Amino acid sequence: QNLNGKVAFVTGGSRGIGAAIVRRLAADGADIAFTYVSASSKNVATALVQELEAKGRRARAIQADSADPAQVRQAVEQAIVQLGPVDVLVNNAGIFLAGPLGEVTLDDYERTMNINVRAPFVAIQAAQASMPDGGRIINIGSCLAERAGRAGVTLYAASKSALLGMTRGLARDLGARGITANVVHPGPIDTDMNPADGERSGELVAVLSLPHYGEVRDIAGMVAFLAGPDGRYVTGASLAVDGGFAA
Amino acid sequence: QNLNGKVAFVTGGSRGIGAAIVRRLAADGADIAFTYVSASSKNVATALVQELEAKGRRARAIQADSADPAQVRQAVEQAIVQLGPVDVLVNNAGIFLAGPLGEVTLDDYERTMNINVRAPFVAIQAAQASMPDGGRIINIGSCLAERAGRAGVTLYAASKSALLGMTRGLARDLGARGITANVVHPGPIDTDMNPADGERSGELVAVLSLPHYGEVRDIAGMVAFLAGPDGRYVTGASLAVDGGFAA
Amino acid sequence: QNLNGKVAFVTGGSRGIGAAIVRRLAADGADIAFTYVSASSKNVATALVQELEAKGRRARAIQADSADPAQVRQAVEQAIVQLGPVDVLVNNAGIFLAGPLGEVTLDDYERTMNINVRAPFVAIQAAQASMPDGGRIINIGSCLAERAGRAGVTLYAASKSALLGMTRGLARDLGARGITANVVHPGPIDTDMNPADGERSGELVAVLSLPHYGEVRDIAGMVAFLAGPDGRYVTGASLAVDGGFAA
Amino acid sequence: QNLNGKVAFVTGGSRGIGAAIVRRLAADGADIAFTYVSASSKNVATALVQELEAKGRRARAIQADSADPAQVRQAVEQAIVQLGPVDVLVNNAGIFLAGPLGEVTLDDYERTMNINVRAPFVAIQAAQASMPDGGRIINIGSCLAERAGRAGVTLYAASKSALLGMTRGLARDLGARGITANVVHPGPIDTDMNPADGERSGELVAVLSLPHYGEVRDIAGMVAFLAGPDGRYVTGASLAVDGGFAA
Ligand SMILES: NC(=O)C1=CN([C@@H]2O[C@H](COP(=O)(O)OP(=O)(O)OC[C@H]3O[C@@H](n4cnc5c(N)ncnc54)[C@H](OP(=O)(O)O)[C@@H]3O)[C@@H](O)[C@H]2O)C=CC1
Ligand SMILES: NC(=O)C1=CN([C@@H]2O[C@H](COP(=O)(O)OP(=O)(O)OC[C@H]3O[C@@H](n4cnc5c(N)ncnc54)[C@H](OP(=O)(O)O)[C@@H]3O)[C@@H](O)[C@H]2O)C=CC1
Ligand SMILES: NC(=O)C1=CN([C@@H]2O[C@H](COP(=O)(O)OP(=O)(O)OC[C@H]3O[C@@H](n4cnc5c(N)ncnc54)[C@H](OP(=O)(O)O)[C@@H]3O)[C@@H](O)[C@H]2O)C=CC1
Ligand SMILES: NC(=O)C1=CN([C@@H]2O[C@H](COP(=O)(O)OP(=O)(O)OC[C@H]3O[C@@H](n4cnc5c(N)ncnc54)[C@H](OP(=O)(O)O)[C@@H]3O)[C@@H](O)[C@H]2O)C=CC1
């Protein structure tokens, strides 16, 4: 289709929104490389690769801890060597540590900032060197980057709003090559990080414009749109897929 | 066909961005009704309708001056009886009157607010009474709504930023019915109203992230995405298709 | 006395937030002219003039229905004849019509748009020609301009988000003369229009960062800061005085 | 003296914007503690302290590299013991590293994020434990957090937009104690880091609404406003003092 002949790199592709993104981009015809960290995700990841090869797509699963900048850079470099320069980079892997402000530890701080901020920045730096003209960079942000709404999300909210300025700076840095950079903001999305049946799920739905959690395909479709022909003129933008959480 | 069996209504569908939207939504399978104002556009408008019928879509062109609240309301009422309840309402017709602040007249003001603000609001009121659950409302705004950037556009920017609160409030009003309301913000788009080769065009390209005007298909593609299945959880959002004018 | 020798114009200065603005600006040394609409307010307004003159300030009370553009223009012109060119223009008078979207009437729309949008533009257009270099324009917006948050405020929200684009275009139109233009956004404020003890008031406090309504001096203080020496480099900004409603 | 009897903490208080803040908050009557990093600033820092003591204020200058979390925490703890619990915390010290995206180094990343993001978070965590009810947190951000405008500022813009989410979450975390948290975004301000006569200054003045750089008093005045009685209902806000750079 419209991604035929293109290479996509997706951090966190083993499950949740990232697995939905890799499936959607592969269906659009991209060759896919994606990362995972947890040892418990190794089986899921190699099964995911087998599912994509069975559809005739090239695919690689790469273990790379986003907490470690060297591991993210190596993953991209390995992806480039095996599939070629990356056309679509999707920074999706994330961590959510929430709680009373006085209990936040330095490990909470370094871990959140390395995974949610520095890793996307390192993947971009590694990928951009050889990204073909008209390339795409798509960061997964969060509705909490633009509105905290509640107590207990200060550190997470700061890591995710760091991507706003990073994305706008990237759209300026790379626009002369036709490369676009956008950040997508999910509202509540039914995944393991945020189950739709969690005890907190109900008070959250109460503040949405649409009275329900979204689904992982909602995010994958926004990403597929920014990745394809229809995204060519969208850049530097914050695109909320949040059910009207912000309205 | 992502829009098969749906009805779409589009103000200002005879040329420019509005024409590209009607072609795109019909090509996605929607029956289309759209408005035009000048008698000079009557030929172009009815040629457009036969072009869609020749592709097997039902389509109707209705002459309705956006300045007149009854004409817009009657235009929507006519489309509902001829094509059925509208699933996709696209408020696109607009006027751009620019110049020194001291030279602004009351006719400039009433004409700008009647066309850019009141006409969409009237069209939404007529369409919403019978819009099926899961429907879509899409206002065409402007990058000048979020950043004026220059002298001489105060009246126009006020009329477009008026769609921001209107859209967010509509998302809340209609969200229990699954209906979404979004505003898309064009950057410079090569049209009759904004030619890519106008004498001021170069200084506008100079402040962009991507160094060229966009094209009418770029706005149409965003509209088609919000109109379809992948837009189902986007609501109350402002979506820039501006080449990074805002980055 | 940072406003000594300056003239202020305040729509709606007879009560609520506008009465607090005229009091605060006069205490800073401004000669003041302000408008009222209700004949029932003539006693409060002329009482307000008497209180200011007893403090040695020049003051004028001018009846001007904001629904009528001509009355606003003539009020500004009279203030100018009486006190000299206005240094500080404060657009405060406003109307709040809320309710179900299907019950909005054209009278609701016309009255809301004339009072909340056209009247400020007309006052600015009257005052700007002879506004001294370094003057100030301050529009009173609302937190609902940036976030509707709930159903029933669509029309009001659109009227208020119209001031964002108008204010940013004015900051461009007039900045070469040193004139600033800003919009202030009250959060819930205890006044006649929004009593703190209304039966609906409690659910609103529940979404604030500070757990209470604000007070009219909170807006008056923000206005005084913009009017005076510390505001000289602030222009085109949206300033929330909303108790953290948007946070 | 609206800050009488209160204690203020200001990182980077020896010169530029931070010195003007320490002078303004002391002149409003606060006892002040502030940090510096360079051994070369030790004379300037202790001279500033003597200037404040000569006006009758208590003041302490503490060398503390913001890059080092323990030094930042230690400085806040030392000031709490010496001057008492902090009422007004001003995170001002910052670093600007600009250049091509591909040349950004690990040290550029680590130093920018440790200084612009982590140090403010650490100062806040230390001060908030004993901050008196009704206190104020004021982060110094940048107009580049909200709009990059140009190529070459990606890292810096990411570090500053991180303060947006941090500030909004802090406002929720602390609002129940009456504490406010806001970010001030300077435009170009004539200092050592951004001299008003630099070769790049003219093209920058060309994109402003006011056609000149601001001055350090313009920033000190907005902080003093936030710190005082008139800021009591402002929280979670982004307040631009940018000459209309964003208009
Ligand atoms: N879902 C939501 O409601 C919201 C989500 N977001 C953002 O969406 C993105 C993911 O959403 P979601 O799918 O819900 O998250 P999940 O926790 O459900 O899935 C997490 C994925 O990220 C990967 N990941 C986590 N930490 C690391 C790491 N240190 N190194 C490498 N990979 C890692 C996991 O890999 P493994 O399987 O190997 O652990 C897994 O594939 C995140 O950025 C999150 O912040 C934004 C707003 C709200
Ligand atoms: N193109 C750009 O660079 C930008 C565009 N926009 C917005 O995008 C939208 C369209 O832009 P563009 O395509 O350039 O506009 P064009 O002027 O090229 O096309 C205008 C269309 O609107 C119709 N129209 C105008 N006034 C009325 C009215 N009173 N009643 C009915 N129909 C009317 C015309 O019908 P007829 O053909 O009969 O005249 C025509 O079909 C507008 O909302 C515009 O403000 C915003 C920012 C930048
Ligand atoms: N109150 C709140 O919590 C919020 C307030 N706002 C905005 O703040 C502004 C004032 O709010 P508030 O003071 O609470 O409202 P009030 O009704 O309490 O005070 C209104 C003032 O405006 C004047 N006024 C009202 N309508 C007109 C008109 N058509 N023509 C001329 N003068 C008029 C009245 O004059 P008279 O005495 O002659 O009637 C009165 O002095 C408005 O623009 C409102 O939208 C924004 C968000 C929330
Ligand atoms: N000025 C501008 O044009 C703009 C400024 N800003 C922000 O405003 C704030 C101040 O601006 P400006 O006054 O121009 O900055 P300056 O560089 O002129 O002053 C720097 C101050 O920060 C201190 N400092 C720097 N690094 C450290 C550190 N690692 N540990 C402790 N103290 C440190 C310095 O201490 P010493 O004296 O020991 O060096 C000095 O007091 C910064 O956050 C900046 O990014 C935002 C937008 C535009």
mmCIF file with all atom_site columns, C-alpha atoms in Angstrom, chain A residues 96-106 108-109 112 150-156 200, chain D residues 121 124-126 128-129 166 169-175 177:
data_model
loop_
_atom_site.group_PDB
_atom_site.id
_atom_site.type_symbol
_atom_site.label_atom_id
_atom_site.label_alt_id
_atom_site.label_comp_id
_atom_site.label_asym_id
_atom_site.label_entity_id
_atom_site.label_seq_id
_atom_site.pdbx_PDB_ins_code
_atom_site.Cartn_x
_atom_site.Cartn_y
_atom_site.Cartn_z
_atom_site.occupancy
_atom_site.B_iso_or_equiv
_atom_site.pdbx_formal_charge
_atom_site.auth_seq_id
_atom_site.auth_comp_id
_atom_site.auth_asym_id
_atom_site.auth_atom_id
_atom_site.pdbx_PDB_model_num
ATOM 1  C CA . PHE A 1 96  ? 3.950   5.927  34.110 1.00 0.00 ? 96  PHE A CA 1
ATOM 2  C CA . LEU A 1 97  ? 4.950   6.492  37.700 1.00 0.00 ? 97  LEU A CA 1
ATOM 3  C CA . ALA A 1 98  ? 2.355   8.373  39.607 1.00 0.00 ? 98  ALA A CA 1
ATOM 4  C CA . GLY A 1 99  ? 1.784   9.272  43.232 1.00 0.00 ? 99  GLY A CA 1
ATOM 5  C CA . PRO A 1 100 ? 2.166   11.804 46.047 1.00 0.00 ? 100 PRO A CA 1
ATOM 6  C CA . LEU A 1 101 ? 4.738   14.415 45.162 1.00 0.00 ? 101 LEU A CA 1
ATOM 7  C CA . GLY A 1 102 ? 6.735   13.898 48.341 1.00 0.00 ? 102 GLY A CA 1
ATOM 8  C CA . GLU A 1 103 ? 7.252   10.188 47.714 1.00 0.00 ? 103 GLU A CA 1
ATOM 9  C CA . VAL A 1 104 ? 8.875   10.644 44.285 1.00 0.00 ? 104 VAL A CA 1
ATOM 10 C CA . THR A 1 105 ? 12.398  9.195  44.387 1.00 0.00 ? 105 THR A CA 1
ATOM 11 C CA . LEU A 1 106 ? 15.368  10.037 42.263 1.00 0.00 ? 106 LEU A CA 1
ATOM 12 C CA . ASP A 1 108 ? 11.457  7.561  39.708 1.00 0.00 ? 108 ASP A CA 1
ATOM 13 C CA . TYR A 1 109 ? 12.839  10.777 38.217 1.00 0.00 ? 109 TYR A CA 1
ATOM 14 C CA . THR A 1 112 ? 10.842  8.443  33.819 1.00 0.00 ? 112 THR A CA 1
ATOM 15 C CA . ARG A 1 150 ? -5.541  15.726 39.033 1.00 0.00 ? 150 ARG A CA 1
ATOM 16 C CA . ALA A 1 151 ? -2.954  15.429 41.779 1.00 0.00 ? 151 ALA A CA 1
ATOM 17 C CA . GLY A 1 152 ? -0.253  12.790 41.546 1.00 0.00 ? 152 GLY A CA 1
ATOM 18 C CA . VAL A 1 153 ? 0.950   13.026 37.898 1.00 0.00 ? 153 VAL A CA 1
ATOM 19 C CA . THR A 1 154 ? 3.564   15.841 38.072 1.00 0.00 ? 154 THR A CA 1
ATOM 20 C CA . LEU A 1 155 ? 6.609   13.841 37.014 1.00 0.00 ? 155 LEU A CA 1
ATOM 21 C CA . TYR A 1 156 ? 4.808   11.928 34.313 1.00 0.00 ? 156 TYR A CA 1
ATOM 22 C CA . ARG A 1 200 ? -10.121 4.349  38.952 1.00 0.00 ? 200 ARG A CA 1
ATOM 23 C CA . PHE D 1 121 ? 12.148  19.633 40.445 1.00 0.00 ? 121 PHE D CA 1
ATOM 24 C CA . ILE D 1 124 ? 10.634  22.099 44.650 1.00 0.00 ? 124 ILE D CA 1
ATOM 25 C CA . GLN D 1 125 ? 10.745  18.759 46.391 1.00 0.00 ? 125 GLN D CA 1
ATOM 26 C CA . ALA D 1 126 ? 12.999  20.194 49.112 1.00 0.00 ? 126 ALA D CA 1
ATOM 27 C CA . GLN D 1 128 ? 7.578   22.032 49.472 1.00 0.00 ? 128 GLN D CA 1
ATOM 28 C CA . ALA D 1 129 ? 7.971   19.840 52.518 1.00 0.00 ? 129 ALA D CA 1
ATOM 29 C CA . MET D 1 166 ? 5.662   20.015 35.708 1.00 0.00 ? 166 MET D CA 1
ATOM 30 C CA . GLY D 1 169 ? 0.898   18.989 37.978 1.00 0.00 ? 169 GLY D CA 1
ATOM 31 C CA . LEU D 1 170 ? 2.483   20.884 40.828 1.00 0.00 ? 170 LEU D CA 1
ATOM 32 C CA . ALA D 1 171 ? -0.525  23.198 40.857 1.00 0.00 ? 171 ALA D CA 1
ATOM 33 C CA . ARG D 1 172 ? -2.792  20.180 41.430 1.00 0.00 ? 172 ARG D CA 1
ATOM 34 C CA . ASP D 1 173 ? -0.448  18.547 43.906 1.00 0.00 ? 173 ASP D CA 1
ATOM 35 C CA . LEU D 1 174 ? -0.189  21.629 46.103 1.00 0.00 ? 174 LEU D CA 1
ATOM 36 C CA . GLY D 1 175 ? -3.412  23.589 45.513 1.00 0.00 ? 175 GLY D CA 1
ATOM 37 C CA . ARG D 1 177 ? -2.405  24.054 50.712 1.00 0.00 ? 177 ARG D CA 1
#
